[PDB]
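Q: Hi! Curious about what Isoform 6 of Troponin T, cardiac muscle looks like structurally. Here's the sequence.
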Amino acid sequence: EKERQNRLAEERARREEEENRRKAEDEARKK
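A: Let's find out. The predicted structure is below.
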């Protein structure tokens, strides 16, 4: 269970950092 939950949690965090770098490069284009 913990293996599964941690795997899903890192998948979530990776998607989150994807969106963060994405908004970052968007703002960069606005610059």
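A: A fun detail: The chain has one helix and no strands.
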